[PDB]
Design an enzyme around this catalytic site. Structure first.
Site, PDB file in Angstrom:
ATOM      1  N   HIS A 110     -31.584  -7.604 -26.357  1.00 55.99           N
ATOM      2  CA  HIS A 110     -30.338  -7.832 -25.580  1.00 55.99           C
ATOM      3  C   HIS A 110     -30.363  -7.107 -24.222  1.00 55.99           C
ATOM      4  O   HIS A 110     -29.419  -7.309 -23.431  1.00 55.99           O
ATOM      5  CB  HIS A 110     -29.120  -7.505 -26.408  1.00 55.99           C
ATOM      6  CG  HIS A 110     -28.913  -6.071 -26.718  1.00 55.99           C
ATOM      7  ND1 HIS A 110     -29.127  -5.565 -27.994  1.00 55.99           N
ATOM      8  CD2 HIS A 110     -28.329  -5.085 -25.989  1.00 55.99           C
ATOM      9  CE1 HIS A 110     -28.757  -4.290 -27.991  1.00 55.99           C
ATOM     10  NE2 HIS A 110     -28.293  -3.965 -26.770  1.00 55.99           N
ATOM     11  N   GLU A 154     -34.968  -8.605 -32.604  1.00 58.42           N
ATOM     12  CA  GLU A 154     -34.238  -7.742 -31.625  1.00 58.42           C
ATOM     13  C   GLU A 154     -35.135  -6.700 -30.974  1.00 58.42           C
ATOM     14  O   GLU A 154     -34.578  -5.828 -30.282  1.00 58.42           O
ATOM     15  CB  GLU A 154     -32.994  -7.139 -32.288  1.00 58.42           C
ATOM     16  CG  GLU A 154     -31.919  -6.672 -31.294  1.00 58.42           C
ATOM     17  CD  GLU A 154     -31.421  -7.717 -30.300  1.00 58.42           C
ATOM     18  OE1 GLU A 154     -31.575  -8.932 -30.543  1.00 58.42           O
ATOM     19  OE2 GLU A 154     -30.965  -7.273 -29.214  1.00 58.42           O
ATOM     20  N   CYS A 178     -27.960   2.218 -27.599  1.00 59.50           N
ATOM     21  CA  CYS A 178     -28.976   1.154 -27.836  1.00 59.50           C
ATOM     22  C   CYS A 178     -30.291   1.588 -27.206  1.00 59.50           C
ATOM     23  O   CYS A 178     -30.354   2.147 -26.076  1.00 59.50           O
ATOM     24  CB  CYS A 178     -28.520  -0.252 -27.452  1.00 59.50           C
ATOM     25  SG  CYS A 178     -27.198  -0.844 -28.554  1.00 59.50           S
ATOM     26  N   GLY A 195     -24.022   2.734 -25.388  1.00 56.68           N
ATOM     27  CA  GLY A 195     -24.868   3.746 -24.736  1.00 56.68           C
ATOM     28  C   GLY A 195     -26.002   4.253 -25.621  1.00 56.68           C
ATOM     29  O   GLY A 195     -26.897   4.889 -25.045  1.00 56.68           O
TER      30      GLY A 195
END
Length: 182
Positions: A41, A72, A148, A146
């Site tokens: 992402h 991911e 990730c 914050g």
């Protein structure tokens, strides 16, 4: 404070950079040579900022499993003038549950942040932001925007990178040794 925090600090001090894309600032784990990982992402493009330096992206691959399901994890090769310490020998070979993990973050917002998250479950399937995702680890800590890209470790193992949360639980994508064979 103890041997868990010791292993986590050793990884943060040598194997992380601050990555900035158009979608934000992320903790980024360097694995070996000029190869790093970041949550998919983050939407890595042709140019990324690494510790506030404009850096060409030589390759970026959004990983999927052999069901063609999102994992991911994006593996990035950076046009950087310096190699990472090779930490591939700290990566698990197989999917697993863990005791007593630490989530470690380093950004402009959250510098030198370490969180003892406790027991880590092999959760498996997660609908992550509407996207079916596999190989998810879960921990019972209220993680926040914050974190990730944060690194999940146990003593002696680098097991995942933080990719989301639901306000009560946090979720990490597994790192497996087989992602970084060359």
């Amino acid at each position: 404070m103890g041997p868990g925090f010791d292993f986590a600090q050793a990884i943060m001090k040598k194997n992380t950079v601050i990555a900035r894309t158009e979608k934000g600032e992320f903790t980024m784990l360097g694995v070996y040579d000029r190869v790093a990982v970041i949550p998919t992402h983050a939407s890595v493009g042709e140019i990324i900022y690494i510790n506030d330096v404009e850096t060409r992206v030589l390759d970026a691959c959004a990983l999927r499993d052999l069901t063609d399901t999102n994992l991911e994890i994006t593996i990035v090769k950076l046009d950087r003038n310096q190699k990472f310490r090779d930490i591939r020998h700290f990566l698990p070979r197989c999917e697993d549950d863990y005791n007593d993990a630490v989530l470690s973050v380093h950004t402009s917002k959250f510098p030198n942040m370490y969180i003892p998250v406790g027991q880590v479950t092999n959760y498996g399937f997660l609908n992550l932001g509407g996207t079916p995702t596999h190989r998810i680890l879960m921990y019972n800590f209220p993680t926040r925007a914050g974190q990730c890209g944060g690194v999940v470790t146990t003593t002696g193992k680098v097991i995942g990178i933080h990719v989301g949360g639901n306000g009560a639980q946090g979720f990490a994508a597994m790192l497996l040794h087989s992602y970084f064979t060359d």
